Amino acid sequence: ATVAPIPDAIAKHQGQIKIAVIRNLGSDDNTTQFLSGVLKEGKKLGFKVDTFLSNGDDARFQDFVNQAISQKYDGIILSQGRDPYSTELVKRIVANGIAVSVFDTAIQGDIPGLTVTQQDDASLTNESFGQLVKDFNGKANIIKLWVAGFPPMERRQAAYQALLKQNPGITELESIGAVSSDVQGDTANKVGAVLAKYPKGKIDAIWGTWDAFTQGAYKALQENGRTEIKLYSIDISNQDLQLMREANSPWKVSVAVDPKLIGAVNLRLVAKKIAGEETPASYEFRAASIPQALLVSQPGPVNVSGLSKIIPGWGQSDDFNSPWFATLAAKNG
Numbered sequence: 407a408t409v410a411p412i413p414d415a416i417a418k419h420q421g422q423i424k425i426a427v428i429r430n431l432g433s434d435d436n437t438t439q440f441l442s443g444v445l446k447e448g449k450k451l452g453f454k455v456d457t458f459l460s461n462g463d464d465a466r467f468q469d470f471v472n473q474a475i476s477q478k479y480d481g482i483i484l485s486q487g488r489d490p491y492s493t494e495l496v497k498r499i500v501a502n503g504i505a506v507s508v509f510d511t512a513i514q515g516d517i518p519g520l521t522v523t524q525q526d527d528a529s530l531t532n533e534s535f536g537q538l539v540k541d542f543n544g545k546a547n548i549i550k551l552w553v554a555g556f557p558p559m560e561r562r563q564a565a566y567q568a569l570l571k572q573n574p575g576i577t578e579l580e581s582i583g584a585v586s587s588d589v590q591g592d593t594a595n596k597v598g599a600v601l602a603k604y605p606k607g608k609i610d611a612i613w614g615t616w617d618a619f620t621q622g623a624y625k626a627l628q629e630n631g632r633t634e635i636k637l638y639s640i641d642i643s644n645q646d647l648q649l650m651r652e653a654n655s656p657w658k659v660s661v662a663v664d665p666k667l668i669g670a671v672n673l674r675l676v677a678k679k680i681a682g683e684e685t686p687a688s689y690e691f692r693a694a695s696i697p698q699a700l701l702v703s704q705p706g707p708v709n710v711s712g713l714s715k716i717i718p719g720w721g722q723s724d725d726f727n728s729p730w731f732a733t734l735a736a737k738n739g
């Protein structure tokens with residue numbers, strides 16, 4: 407019936423609240439969706455959101471963060487910050503009075519005022535790689551698509567190694583993957599050469615730990631006539647949904663969180679911090695397992711936004727949705 411008042415620290419601010427988002431990747435589909443979610447949520451709240459991508463170059467990541475600190479942004483969001491530098495970088499953000507939330511970032515210890523956010527990487531693995539195990543009855547020659555050194559990657563690899571220990575008839579032939587400006591093409595080329603080393607019958611499945619990798623493997627399977635190999639992925643994007651619907655498509659499952667929600671929630675967290683509202687030390691997003699047959703059953707293409715119509719509760723959460731967000735949205739549009 408009545409309107410929740412805008413918190414004073416937002417109401418009294420000189421000009422727009424300004425947020426910097428620095429993500430340690432290039433323009434892959436996951437990234438593209440994450441940035442879209444931060445931007446949309448910030449726009450809802452009347453915030454200026456400035457976004458920066460390092461292309462995976464940790465030096466450029468650091469320079470971007472350091473410049474945002476010097477510019478005195480009201481808040482900062484980091485994504486995919488690595489060791490060794492991310493902890494001291496975040497400590498410097500906090501020391502400068504800048505509100506901060508991080509996603510998939512390496513943080514040692516407890517930094518007061520920080521929220522650290524992540525997906526349930528063990529569950530992403532158990533559901534995706536575990537489907538592979540179930541489908542092959544514990545016996546398969548696989549390729550893994552994976553890159554070292556990122557927090558989600560190291561947690562997925564630990565969960566994966568536990569499943570290999572449980573199922574000794576799963577043989578990892580090779581692991582492939584790098585971050586570059588063309589992950590799809592690079593992966594596709596690399597998978598093409600692995601396909602040449604292990605002809606038809608010698609590979610059963612591929613586990614892709616990031617859908618940028620799986621997209622490239624998919625292209626390689628199609629172009630090389632190797633669609634007898636089945637694909638199991640983490641992440642989702644509009645492209646992946648189309649690929650699961652193509653003729654002869656080997657893309658069996660994606661286990662995923664909507665990256666737009668991840669972006670939005672990190673914004674919500676920074677908004678609460680600027681407002682002076684309690685926020686937790688940690689927060690974990692929950693994923694859904696998306697089977698190919700679901701998508702094949704639809705009457706035409708489905709985008710990620712559309713998944714809510716066929717996956718109850720997809721991409722939605724009330725977590726950190728303060729009642730004054732509605733007020734701000736009205737005060738802006």
Ligand SMILES: C[Se]C[C@H]1O[C@H](O)[C@H](O)[C@@H]1O
Nearest residue numbers: 436510556558615616641
């Ligand atoms: C090279 Se890090 C790529 C991963 O970051 C996020 O956790 C997404 O799930 C994507 O798989």
